Structure formats: structure tokens, C-alpha cells
Amino acid sequence: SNKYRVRKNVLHLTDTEKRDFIRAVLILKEKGIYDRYIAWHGAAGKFHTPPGSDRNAAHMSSAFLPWHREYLLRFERDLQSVNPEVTLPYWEWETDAQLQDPSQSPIWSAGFMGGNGNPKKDFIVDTGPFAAGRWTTIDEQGNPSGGLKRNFGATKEAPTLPTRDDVLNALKITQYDTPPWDMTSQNSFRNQLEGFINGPQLHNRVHRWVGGQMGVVPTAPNDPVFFLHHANVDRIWSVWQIVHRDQNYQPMKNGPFGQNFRDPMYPWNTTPEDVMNHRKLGYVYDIEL
Amino acid sequence: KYRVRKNVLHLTDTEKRDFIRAVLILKEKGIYDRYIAWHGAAGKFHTPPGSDRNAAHMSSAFLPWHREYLLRFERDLQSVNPEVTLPYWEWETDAQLQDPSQSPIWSAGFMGGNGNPKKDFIVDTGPFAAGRWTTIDEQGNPSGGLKRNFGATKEAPTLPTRDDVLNALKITQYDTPPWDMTSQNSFRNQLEGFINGPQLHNRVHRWVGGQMGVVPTAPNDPVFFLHHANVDRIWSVWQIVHRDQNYQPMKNGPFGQNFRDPMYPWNTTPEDVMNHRKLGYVYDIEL
Ligand SMILES: [Zn+2]
Ligand SMILES: [Zn+2]
Ligand SMILES: [Zn+2]
Ligand SMILES: [Zn+2]
Ligand SMILES: [Zn+2]
Ligand SMILES: [Zn+2]
Ligand SMILES: [Zn+2]
Ligand SMILES: [Zn+2]
Ligand SMILES: [Zn+2]
Ligand SMILES: [Zn+2]
Ligand SMILES: [Zn+2]
Ligand SMILES: [Zn+2]
Ligand SMILES: [Zn+2]
Ligand SMILES: [Zn+2]
Ligand SMILES: [Zn+2]
Known part of the structure; x- marks a missing residue:
């Protein structure tokens, strides 16, 4: 009950935390650890x-959530080797969506993630x-580039962060995922949270909202907020898991190899089964207490 | 009690x-494509970043990276059939044939033959x-099938010779600064094949041609694994011949090249794979 690592809302962290x-994060970047996560x-x-499918190991399929859960767990263990007092915080974007100007959120302060892109600098982050x-x-190739970019809300498809209602409506869906286990899956928690139902919604919408490297698959983890975004996605999934006790991961079999409960998720040997219970992985979100 | 890695030529028709x-079962299951990627x-x-070193080539981790790679592949083979171990292609022996394309490794019952030049060098056998x-x-999307063009480039008309191997085995240090394709008096770099290259390991890649000829696509060819088992054997001999010597660098190399650093894309370190016997396998000629 206190033996568990506590993953906290960013906004509930002390100046010291x-x-x-x-x-x-900066230590992990300097050591060479951080770039492993980008790749x-x-x-x-x-x-x-x-092969030839539009599904991949980490997106647009059933493995989206367990893939990202293992990702965050590995990243958190590396944080803890630098400083065991540290756990991964989450960005509760659905709350920030209530602000008149969500760029005023303390997440974007010079002491934390730093601010929006500077439009006079082709949207380079020049703060934080x-x-x-x-x-x-x-x-995209694995070779150096020009520094972080962000352009908050600049596309017509994602002018807005997802709302508390978007999250609650996804939480009502009775099934984890459905055939054909991809971006067309209907009545699918995985696919709706991933954000492909009348998309971009939820997870995809937050990527497109931030813009810059965060806006496209190859480069997104260049932005540390990638991890705060995905910790919130992992929290939301963990709530769905309590709300739907009778329900489990899908598919259990007859999905593509790498999407099944007991299949390994490239680039690891980790299976969905290995990460279904987040308590057994040794962590909880602050609001589970 | 040790798994035995045999010369291809020493395998029974059944083996x-x-x-x-x-290999075909691993391809059908989806396991094989994990190795390509x-x-x-x-x-x-x-x-x-910005360097011409990478996790698997052109640096100290070349040999331990490939050793872990082969071990993982062998364990997946064994889950399909525990009787199976990884064979090695002794290319330095084949180099003594007038026409190394006549080697029984290239038979329709095993790796199949050279590229058909009437078919833009597609492998249409085996x-x-x-x-x-x-x-x-290169991008991870499907393509046109295996290609091979044995000896077709001017830089690699020839397989490496027993002399190339023996001369590399005489080099007194595993690797040297600056831990890259310029490293001089470096076992790693000479076996990798960058000293007056392409030599040895790089030369076998360029000799085969097709997907085997370039980094992004090479493991599309199962011979990739028989090639690299031979490289791993040759390294294992160097390790016995040079008891005085161990892996380098131990520190102050790039992150991912040091003895106790993890090798992208795994957590496996060079230290974890230095002793091939402890990994549970030997090459047939160590008996
Ligand atoms: Zn521009
Ligand atoms: Zn590159
Ligand atoms: Zn994402
Ligand atoms: Zn992503
Ligand atoms: Zn329910
Ligand atoms: Zn398991
Ligand atoms: Zn809290
Ligand atoms: Zn013999
Ligand atoms: Zn693709
Ligand atoms: Zn030899
Ligand atoms: Zn190679
Ligand atoms: Zn290679
Ligand atoms: Zn010596
Ligand atoms: Zn170790
Ligand atoms: Zn033998």
C-alpha cells in the first residue's frame, strides 16, 4: 500500500521532485541511455x-498499450538508477484542456518541459x-538534427487537447480490442484511447496538438513530454482495467504475430501477459490510493 | 553436455x-523478421550520434553484438527443434576452390545457388x-526476393584465404582507439574487415552481393548466420591464442562499446558474452 512506486500528476509534484x-532525464541523455528509447x-x-500491413509492434494494433507500458517501465528503471527517489509523472492533458490557454499550464514552465515553439525561430523550443x-x-534516420520543435494546436485536425468527456466515453467501452486488431477496430478501448475513432482523438490528438518531433512517429520521444503523455495513457488504461474486471487483453490467439497475449513485442521478448498487472510491475498511479 | 556448432560440410543430410x-518455421511464425529488424x-x-560507429558494426561491439544475435537465433531454432544448432560456413576453405560457387553449401538442398543473371540475379534455387x-x-516493407551475385564487384572478387584468417589471429590486441573503422593493429577491426578493406567479414558480405552486400538487408539471406557463426568461431580461437588479452575498451569508449555497457537493441553487455563455453556452446573443432 506504500511499498509501491507512486506515479504522480506532474501538477502535484514539489519544486524538488x-x-x-x-x-x-538530462543525466540519461548525457550517458547515452535516453537515445536507446528514441530508437x-x-x-x-x-x-x-x-509485413505489408499498416499495423506495427508499438502502434495501430492491440500491442499499442502493453508495448508503451513496457517502454515506460524500462525508462523508469533507468531514471531510478540515476535517482531512486524519482518515479515517472503523468501529464493529465484532459484537465489542461479546461484552460483558456493550455500553454499557461505549469508543465510548460522554464523549470519543467519549457514552452511552445518560438515562431520567429521556425518553432524551435528556446525555453526550459x-x-x-x-x-x-x-x-528519422538516427543522425543529429536542429533541436526540439513544438507548435501547440497549429493543425486544423487537432486544435484542441482531449477533454475529460473524451476519456470517460473511452472508459465505458466494454472490450479491450476487436478484429481486425488495427486502426479500423470498432467498439475498441485500445483503438479509441490510441485515438483512431473519428481521429485524431485522445492519444494521437495529444501528439498532433504538441506538433514538432512529438507530431510524427519516427521522432516523438525526442520530447521528454512523450513519457508524461504516455504515463497518462498508461494510467487511463489501468483505470479501464479496474472498471472492467471481467475483461482481459485481446487477441489471446489468431491475431498477427506480436499482437497475441503470449507473443513477444519487438524490439523485446516482453509479452502483453508480462505487463497486464501494473501492480506486479511494482508501481501505482497516485489516485489509486 | 555442450551444444556443438559444426562445419556445414560435417553435417549429415538429416542435420x-x-x-x-x-529456419523456414521461424520465417512462417514471424520470429525470423525480428532478426532482420x-x-x-x-x-x-x-x-x-553523428559518428560512423554503430551498435553492431564499425566499433568494438561488432563481435559481442553478433555473438548475442547468433545465440538468440540459436535458442529460437532450438524451440522449433532442440536437436538443431547453428552451423558455420568455413569460407576461407571454400576460397581454395577454383569456383567457390561449386561448394555444397550452395546446393538446392541447403542455401541454394548464386543469383540467376537472366533474372536480374534473383536466387531461383533452394x-x-x-x-x-x-x-x-531498407525501410521494413516487403521486396522482390533474395539476390546474390558471387564475386561480381572489383573490390571483392574473392573470398578471404586461410592466410587472411591466420594473419588476423596474430594481432595482439582485441581493439584500439579510436574504436572505429580506422583502428590499427585491431583484431576486431581486421576481422570485421576494414584494414585495406573490404577484407575478411566485410569481404564475404560484398562477395555474396544482393541483400547480403549491404547492412540494412543482409540477414534476408540465411547464409548471414553461417557467415557470422564462422566469424564467431574465428574470434573464439583468437580468445584462446591470446589468454593475456581481453575485450577493449573497458572504459572511455562511446556508450554501448564498453565492456559493461548494454548493446542496443538489448541490455546484453560484451562482458555477458565474452566466454562462449559459459553461453552453453562450442565449435566442433574445439573437441
Ligand atoms: Zn519550417
Ligand atoms: Zn545513420
Ligand atoms: Zn504515442
Ligand atoms: Zn508512438
Ligand atoms: Zn465492463
Ligand atoms: Zn511471459
Ligand atoms: Zn497526487
Ligand atoms: Zn573436417
Ligand atoms: Zn513502414
Ligand atoms: Zn581457418
Ligand atoms: Zn556481418
Ligand atoms: Zn551487419
Ligand atoms: Zn598474445
Ligand atoms: Zn552483466
Ligand atoms: Zn565436425
């Missing part, structure tokens, strides 16, 4: 299940610890 | 058949012929 998280996600993005020249970036 | 079947992803993971065996391109 915020500072310790930023320091761990895993990109490689997973280009690994199709099966991950500003251009304080924080290097990788392009 | 040859059982190996081909395990790991290698390609590792190829595009630079240590550090179990991995176009239309029996799918391939992945």
Missing part, C-alpha cells in the same frame, strides 16, 4: 505485423532544459 | 534438412528462392 526528474520507438514504428543547444535531437 | 526446416535498427544506431521466401527492404 520536478527538479530531480529533469536532472535524471526502440522508431524501430518498433517500422516493424509491421505482418530541452531548448535547442541544451538538448540534442535525432532525425 | 542439413532439420536446420533448413527450423534488430540488425538494421542496430546499423542506424550511432555511438555516439529453399530461399524468390516466391518461396519473402524479403524486407
Whole structure:
């Protein structure tokens, strides 16, 4: 009940907790650990299940949630090797969606994620610890690039963060996922939270809202907010799991290889079964207490 | 009690058949494509960024990276058929044939033959012929089937010789600064094949041509694994011949190249794979 790592709302962190998280992230970048996460996600993005399909190991299929859960767990263990006091916080974007100007959220402060893109600098982030020249970036190929970009709400398809209602409506869906286990799956928790139902919604919508590297699959984890975004997605999934006790992961069999309960998820040997119970992985979200 | 990795040439017709079947089962199950992608992803993971070193090539981790790769592949073979171990292609012996394309490794019952020049060098023989065996391109999408063009380039008309191997075995240090394709008096770099290259390991890649000829696509060819088993054997001999010596760098190399660093895309370290006996296998000629 207190033996569990607690994953907290960013906004509930002390100035010291915020500072310790930023320091761990910067240490992981300098050591070479952070870039492993950029590459895993990109490689997973280009690994199709099966070949020629528009499904991949990490997106547009059943493995989206368990893939990202293992991803966050590995990243958290690396944070903890720098500083065991640190756990992964979540960005509750559905709350920030209530602000007149969501760029005023303390997540975007110079002491945390830093601010929106500067439009006079072709939308380079020139504030916070991950500003251009304080924080290097990788392009689609794996070679260096020009620094972090962000353009909050700049596309017509995602002018807005998802709302508490978007989240609650997804939480009502009775099945984890449905055939054909892809971006067309109807009445699918996985697919609706992923955000492909009348998309971009929810998870996809937050990616497109931030824009910059965060806006496209190959580069998204260049932005540390990638992890705060995905911690919130993982929390929302963990709530669905309590609300629907009778329900389990799908498919259990006859999905593409890498999408089944007991299949390994490229680029790891980790299976969905291995990550279904988040308590057994040794963590809880603060609101589960 | 040790699993025995044998010379292809020392395999029974049944051992040859059982190996081909395990490889085809791994392809059908979806396991094989994980190996293609790991290698390609590792190829595009630079240590550090902007460098021409990567996790799997052109640096100290080349040999331990490939050793872990082969071990993982062998364990997956064994889950299909526990009787199966990874064979090695002793290319330095084949190099003594007037026409190394006559080697029984290239028979229709095993790797199948050279590219057909009337078919833009598509392999149209053996179990991995176009239309029996799918391939992945540089980007991870399907492609036209296996190609091979034995000896077709001016830079690699020839397989490496027993002399090339023995001369590399005499080099007194595993690797040297700056831990890349310029490393001089480096076992790793000379066996990798960058000293007056393409030599040895790189030369066998360029000699075969087709997908085997370039980093992103090479494991589309099962011979990739027989090639690399021979590289791993040759390294294992160097390790006995040079007791005084161990892996380098131990520290102050790029992250992912140090003895105790993890090798993208795994957590496996060079230290974890230095002793091949402890990993539970030997090459047949160690008996
Ligand atoms: Zn693709
Ligand atoms: Zn522009
Ligand atoms: Zn995402
Ligand atoms: Zn993603
Ligand atoms: Zn229910
Ligand atoms: Zn398991
Ligand atoms: Zn709280
Ligand atoms: Zn013999
Ligand atoms: Zn590159
Ligand atoms: Zn020899
Ligand atoms: Zn190779
Ligand atoms: Zn290679
Ligand atoms: Zn010596
Ligand atoms: Zn270790
Ligand atoms: Zn033998």
C-alpha cells in the first residue's frame, strides 16, 4: 500500500521532485541511455505485423498499450538508477484542456518541459532544459538534427487537447480490442484511447496538438513530454482495467504475430501477459490510493 | 553436455534438412523478421550520434553484438527443434576452390545457388528462392526476393584465404582507439574487415552481393548466420591464442562499446558474452 512506486500528476509534484526528474532525464541523455528509447520507438514504428500491413509492434494494433507500458517501465528503471527517489509523472492533458490557454499550464514552465515553439525561430523550443543547444535531437534516420520543435494546436485536425468527456466515453467501452486488431477496430478501448475513432482523438490528438518531433512517429520521444503523455495513457488504461474486471487483453490467439497475449513485442521478448498487472510491475498511479 | 556448432560440410543430410526446416518455421511464425529488424535498427544506431560507429558494426561491439544475435537465433531454432544448432560456413576453405560457387553449401538442398543473371540475379534455387521466401527492404516493407551475385564487384572478387584468417589471429590486441573503422593493429577491426578493406567479414558480405552486400538487408539471406557463426568461431580461437588479452575498451569508449555497457537493441553487455563455453556452446573443432 506504500511499498509501491507512486506515479504522480506532474501538477502535484514539489519544486524538488520536478527538479530531480529533469536532472535524471538530462543525466540519461548525457550517458547515452535516453537515445536507446528514441530508437526502440522508431524501430518498433517500422516493424509491421505482418509485413505489408499498416499495423506495427508499438502502434495501430492491440500491442499499442502493453508495448508503451513496457517502454515506460524500462525508462523508469533507468531514471531510478540515476535517482531512486524519482518515479515517472503523468501529464493529465484532459484537465489542461479546461484552460483558456493550455500553454499557461505549469508543465510548460522554464523549470519543467519549457514552452511552445518560438515562431520567429521556425518553432524551435528556446525555453526550459530541452531548448535547442541544451538538448540534442535525432532525425528519422538516427543522425543529429536542429533541436526540439513544438507548435501547440497549429493543425486544423487537432486544435484542441482531449477533454475529460473524451476519456470517460473511452472508459465505458466494454472490450479491450476487436478484429481486425488495427486502426479500423470498432467498439475498441485500445483503438479509441490510441485515438483512431473519428481521429485524431485522445492519444494521437495529444501528439498532433504538441506538433514538432512529438507530431510524427519516427521522432516523438525526442520530447521528454512523450513519457508524461504516455504515463497518462498508461494510467487511463489501468483505470479501464479496474472498471472492467471481467475483461482481459485481446487477441489471446489468431491475431498477427506480436499482437497475441503470449507473443513477444519487438524490439523485446516482453509479452502483453508480462505487463497486464501494473501492480506486479511494482508501481501505482497516485489516485489509486 | 555442450551444444556443438559444426562445419556445414560435417553435417549429415538429416542435420542439413532439420536446420533448413527450423529456419523456414521461424520465417512462417514471424520470429525470423525480428532478426532482420534488430540488425538494421542496430546499423542506424550511432555511438555516439553523428559518428560512423554503430551498435553492431564499425566499433568494438561488432563481435559481442553478433555473438548475442547468433545465440538468440540459436535458442529460437532450438524451440522449433532442440536437436538443431547453428552451423558455420568455413569460407576461407571454400576460397581454395577454383569456383567457390561449386561448394555444397550452395546446393538446392541447403542455401541454394548464386543469383540467376537472366533474372536480374534473383536466387531461383533452394529453399530461399524468390516466391518461396519473402524479403524486407531498407525501410521494413516487403521486396522482390533474395539476390546474390558471387564475386561480381572489383573490390571483392574473392573470398578471404586461410592466410587472411591466420594473419588476423596474430594481432595482439582485441581493439584500439579510436574504436572505429580506422583502428590499427585491431583484431576486431581486421576481422570485421576494414584494414585495406573490404577484407575478411566485410569481404564475404560484398562477395555474396544482393541483400547480403549491404547492412540494412543482409540477414534476408540465411547464409548471414553461417557467415557470422564462422566469424564467431574465428574470434573464439583468437580468445584462446591470446589468454593475456581481453575485450577493449573497458572504459572511455562511446556508450554501448564498453565492456559493461548494454548493446542496443538489448541490455546484453560484451562482458555477458565474452566466454562462449559459459553461453552453453562450442565449435566442433574445439573437441
Ligand atoms: Zn513502414
Ligand atoms: Zn519550417
Ligand atoms: Zn504515442
Ligand atoms: Zn508512438
Ligand atoms: Zn465492463
Ligand atoms: Zn511471459
Ligand atoms: Zn497526487
Ligand atoms: Zn573436417
Ligand atoms: Zn545513420
Ligand atoms: Zn581457418
Ligand atoms: Zn556481418
Ligand atoms: Zn551487419
Ligand atoms: Zn598474445
Ligand atoms: Zn552483466
Ligand atoms: Zn565436425
